[PDB]
Design a protein around this ligand. Structure first.
Ligand code: SAH
Ligand code: ZN
Lengths: 176, 19, 159
């Protein structure tokens, strides 16, 4: 079954024994899930358990070469959504996307890779708009990057807290 | 060429053989 | 008794990175070289890559040439599967041919998957180039690639 990866992670991140919860340590660092997707439409959820002052998260999708010692969205291998101001990040360019998210929010992550690629982010079930289209081809892993000591939990499915309306996908847990 | 450490099985598409 | 094949396989995967390396070769271009003595019958390196069904090799050759990518780096496992290391692979891509080689290839099955592993045919000493016999099909006179392996029992051509 799908978990946060055992070796494919920054070492400084504090990951729970069940491997679904992760706490940040100092500068931005990243963990990928154990499974990735190449085609089709897929979904997973992240809950912000705790976001103390001066902490942040950049969440989204990463290819295997995305740098583990940088925020998600740092390089060409990943696309991210920042808790602060809801900025979307790719190749370290941050663009206007949505408003911010924080403690208690449940964030939804959709990707479609048709066999016209898209990445769409959700906040508590509400589509926040297409963030990126025609993305690089490759294998995309659910990915978490945290700036200091905040805490997030990832849900790969099959059951989601805020399953989006009028959106077809498979839960990431179908890869398990 | 991307370096690889372990073998990867190609996952063929349904249309792998089509024009 | 001998070690179970999967245990020999992790040890290889764990230690091959520090025992071999790629350098310029007196035989041809770049080759794989020995950085620590290797005992006879030990695993040297896996020929890693994308494992494809044999039927897909034809489609992939024509694709590689259409993009003007140069030569393919495909090693056949058996009649049914091939390791394609053209775009994804490891340092085993660079092992040159020798008419008197110090390595050989062997297919091993680990957890229902097949792997090409290069084995030391004899004790190999650091600084030796690692080579095996390509065993190319005997080709006609029109396209016979000459051999530069530099041995005295050299066959003059790869095919
Ligand atoms: N003994 C030999 N003599 C001349 N060329 C050789 C050779 N063994 C291998 N080669 C060349 O190497 C190719 C196999 S790929 C081996 C790596 C190659 N030496 C390189 O530097 O990239 C063959 O197509 C052949 O052209
Ligand atoms: Zn020769």
């Amino acid at each position: 079954r799908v978990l946060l990866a055992l070796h494919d992670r920054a070492p400084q991140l504090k990951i729970s024994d069940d491997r679904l919860t992760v706490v940040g340590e100092k500068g931005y660092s990243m963990v990928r899930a154990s499974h990735g997707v190449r085609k089709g439409a897929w979904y997973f959820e992240i809950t912000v358990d705790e976001m103390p002052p001066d902490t942040a998260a950049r969440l989204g999708w990463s290819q295997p070469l995305g740098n583990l010692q940088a925020p998600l969205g740092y390089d060409k291998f990943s696309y991210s959504w920042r808790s602060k101001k809801g900025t979307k990040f790719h190749q370290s360019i941050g663009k206007h996307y949505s408003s911010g998210y924080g403690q208690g929010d449940v964030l939804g992550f959709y990707i479609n890779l048709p066999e016209s690629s898209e990445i769409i982010f959700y906040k508590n079930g509400v589509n926040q708009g297409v963030a990126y289209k025609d993305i690089f081809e490759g294998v995309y892993f659910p990915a978490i990057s945290l700036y200091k000591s905040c805490t997030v939990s990832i849900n790969f499915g099959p059951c989601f807290k805020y399953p989006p309306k009028d959106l077809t996908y498979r839960p990431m847990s179908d890869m398990g | 060429f991307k370096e690889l450490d372990e073998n990867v099985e190609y996952e063929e598409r349904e249309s792998e053989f089509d024009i | 008794s001998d070690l179970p094949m999967p245990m020999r396989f992790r040890h290889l995967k764990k230690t091959s990175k520090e025992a071999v390396g790629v350098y310029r070769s007196p035989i041809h271009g770049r080759g794989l070289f020995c950085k620590r003595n290797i005992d006879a019958g030990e695993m040297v390196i896996e020929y890693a890559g994308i494992v494809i069904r044999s039927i897909l090799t034809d489609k992939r050759e024509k694709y590689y040439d259409s993009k003007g990518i140069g030569s393919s780096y495909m090693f056949r496992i058996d009649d049914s599967e091939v390791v394609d290391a053209t775009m994804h692979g490891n340092a085993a891509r660079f092992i040159n041919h020798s008419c008197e080689p110090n390595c050989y290839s062997r297919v091993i099955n680990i957890d229902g998957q097949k792997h090409i592993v290069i084995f030391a045919m004899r004790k190999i000493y650091r600084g030796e180039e690692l080579t095996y016999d390509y065993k190319f099909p005997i080709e006609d006179a029109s396209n016979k690639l000459p051999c530069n392996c530099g041995a005295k029992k050299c066959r003059k051509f790869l095919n």
